[PDB]
Enzyme design. Sequence first.
Site, PDB file in Angstrom:
ATOM      1  N   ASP A  25       0.729  -1.131   0.011  1.00 37.53           N
ATOM      2  CA  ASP A  25       0.064   0.154  -0.160  1.00 37.53           C
ATOM      3  C   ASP A  25       0.903   1.182  -0.007  1.00 37.53           C
ATOM      4  O   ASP A  25       1.302   1.574   1.139  1.00 37.53           O
ATOM      5  CB  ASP A  25      -0.906  -0.089   1.231  1.00 37.53           C
ATOM      6  CG  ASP A  25      -2.051   0.939   1.012  1.00 37.53           C
ATOM      7  OD1 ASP A  25      -1.970   1.906   0.307  1.00 37.53           O
ATOM      8  OD2 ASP A  25      -2.978   1.037   2.020  1.00 37.53           O
ATOM      9  N   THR A  26       1.049   1.870  -1.140  1.00 36.57           N
ATOM     10  CA  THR A  26       1.947   2.922  -1.326  1.00 36.57           C
ATOM     11  C   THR A  26       1.349   4.163  -0.672  1.00 36.57           C
ATOM     12  O   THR A  26       1.830   5.230  -0.409  1.00 36.57           O
ATOM     13  CB  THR A  26       2.313   3.386  -2.791  1.00 36.57           C
ATOM     14  OG1 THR A  26       0.985   3.567  -3.556  1.00 36.57           O
ATOM     15  CG2 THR A  26       2.858   2.058  -3.408  1.00 36.57           C
ATOM     16  N   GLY A  27      -0.063   4.128  -0.548  1.00 39.89           N
ATOM     17  CA  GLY A  27      -0.676   5.210   0.185  1.00 39.89           C
ATOM     18  C   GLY A  27      -0.756   5.312   1.731  1.00 39.89           C
ATOM     19  O   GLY A  27      -1.442   6.183   2.358  1.00 39.89           O
TER      20      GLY A  27
END
Lengths: 99, 99
Positions: A25-27
């Site tokens: 999850d880059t967010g």
Amino acid sequence: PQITLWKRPLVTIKIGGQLKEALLDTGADDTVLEEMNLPGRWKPIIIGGIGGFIKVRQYDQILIEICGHKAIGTVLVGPTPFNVIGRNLLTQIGCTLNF
Amino acid sequence: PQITLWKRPLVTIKIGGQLKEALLDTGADDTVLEEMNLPGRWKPIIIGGIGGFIKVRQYDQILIEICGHKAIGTVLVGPTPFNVIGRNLLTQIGCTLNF
Ligand SMILES: CC(C)CN(C[C@@H](O)[C@H](Cc1ccccc1)NC(=O)O[C@H]1CO[C@H]2OCC[C@H]21)S(=O)(=O)c1ccc(N)cc1
């Protein structure tokens, strides 16, 4: 490995001897996992996103193997709907976004 | 471009003639943006996240130019704390995770 985003970027993780699956999850700034037991001192903290906030237990310097790649970093434990591997650990395995 | 994850993967988007900064969020199925006018029709829906759920307005077949790359897809509009570009649009620009 390279990973396309047509399906959820789920990978297998090994933490505290347990096997689990988690989102890359880059967010997510931080790593949040479902309820489980981990070693050492933890402090209560609160994180938030879309929909509101939740209460989690912050464990520092926790060893994780994310798709066979090792990383030591903070791991938050609480009532998250999904296990997500945040940037705090994605950086350790050298993950990047490419287009 | 490649993008490391030591800082939030923010990028500039152009949608509806407006300029905005948004997250490249592999953990997000679909794109969610702050309040704004989107010329066209929509339907009320509800997405959920880490700590609850919000009410967003769904717009379909919306053009976005993300970091110079064009894509057309669904865009949800509502009280999101941050603008996130979800997988529904990341796939359009050929975005991948690599480690
Ligand atoms: C719930 C997750 C599986 C997916 N989410 C995207 C995720 O990346 C959000 C995206 C995000 C980013 C900032 C603010 C809100 C949401 N970040 C997040 O929840 O991370 C929290 C743990 O690490 C911290 O980092 C910031 C928030 C904390 S989500 O916001 O709920 C979401 C769900 C559906 C869509 N279509 C779009 C987004």
